[PDB]
Design a protein around this ligand. Structure first.
Ligand SMILES: COc1cc(-c2cn(CC(=O)Nc3cc(C4CC4)nn3-c3ccccc3)nn2)ccc1-n1cnc(C)c1
Ligand SMILES: [Cl-]
Length: 285
């Protein structure tokens, strides 16, 4: 039940990013909800079946913390996928520009430049956890949860996607095991690195790594290490250090996501419930 969009109704503004399989542009869309900003993904190239499967999946996935999908454009070439426009771009970039050095990075006119506070970091964390609760409820395995795969809209609205253009400007976040198989090893637990076992339990481990990215203002996990050294540390069971901005109670949540046995990891629903309770308790303080 994929919604179709006339090519005449899409006005491309500029190219945001490019990957091996697609191109993402900022665009204007007419008669969707007159003149609306949207983000358009163009299919570069089998590929048409993957595009069809994705469009169907994105029409079915509907949640306030999953990237909004408006439809496709199958009239002519390239094939297009229309997504919502999220002003603040990807969450990794957003965290890096609203960190301890935000004042140095800020434009002269930027509103109240400075590092995000605890309340804001907990609201970002709780929103990503809510999206992961929804996917787990559908028995859907993301396999590449990371802040680079989240978008931030005006009003600190956070939504999860799966971009693969992430595999271009964030090519350093992937390890090539062979051919075209790019693994986000720094976000993966030992069973995924060793045997490519991806489940809702390997996604909860990645959510723990997302919490660490959030509380370090977007640092790359294991940044001190090469890909082979990070693989060795993870399989040996080394844990990421508690971030300076991370309260001990948030680090206890990360540790719950990082239990060695996948079945011993806390469920994403309990992780979200705990994050939502900490965000509520801090609201007025
Ligand atoms: C990086 O920025 C954007 C990048 C996209 C975008 C979208 N997609 C596809 C995409 O997100 N796909 C997707 C989402 C999911 C959900 C987690 C469950 N699953 N899959 C999925 C499934 C099977 C196979 C491949 C993917 N790729 N790029 C869109 C807007 C934006 N942007 C906005 N605003 C701005 C300024 C940019
Ligand atoms: Cl602890």
């Amino acid at each position: 039940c994929v919604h179709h969009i006339k090519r005449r109704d899409i006005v491309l503004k500029w190219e945001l990013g490019e990957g091996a399989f697609g191109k993402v542009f900022l665009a204007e869309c007419h008669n969707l909800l007159d003149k609306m900003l949207v983000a358009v993904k163009a299919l570069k190239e089998s590929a048409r079946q993957d595009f069809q499967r994705e469009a169907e999946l994105l029409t079915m996935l509907q949640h306030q913390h999953i990237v909004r999908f408006f439809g496709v454009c199958t009239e002519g070439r390239p094939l297009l996928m229309v997504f919502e426009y999220m002003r603040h771009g990807d969450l990794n970039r957003f965290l890096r520009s609203h960190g301890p050095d935000a004042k140095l990075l800020a434009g002269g006119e930027d509103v109240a430049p400075g590092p995000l506070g605890l309340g804001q970091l907990l609201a970002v964390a709780s929103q990503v956890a809510a999206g992961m609760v929804y996917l787990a409820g559908l028995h859907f395995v993301h396999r590449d949860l990371a802040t680079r795969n989240c978008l931030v809209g005006q009003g600190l609205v956070v939504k999860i996607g799966d971009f693969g253009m992430s595999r271009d400007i964030y090519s350093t976040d992937y390890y090539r095991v062979g051919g075209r198989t790019m693994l986000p090893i720094r976000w993966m637990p030992p069973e995924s690195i060793l045997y490519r076992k991806f489940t809702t339990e390997s996604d909860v481990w990645s959510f723990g790594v997302v919490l660490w990215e959030i509380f370090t203002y977007g640092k790359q996990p294991w940044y001190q290490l090469s890909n082979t050294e990070a693989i060795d540390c993870i399989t040996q069971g080394r844990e990421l250090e508690r971030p300076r901005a991370c309260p001990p109670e948030v680090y206890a949540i990360m540790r719950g996501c990082w239990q060695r046995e996948p079945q011993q990891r806390h469920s994403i629903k309990d992780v979200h419930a705990r994050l939502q309770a900490l965000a509520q308790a801090h609201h007025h303080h």
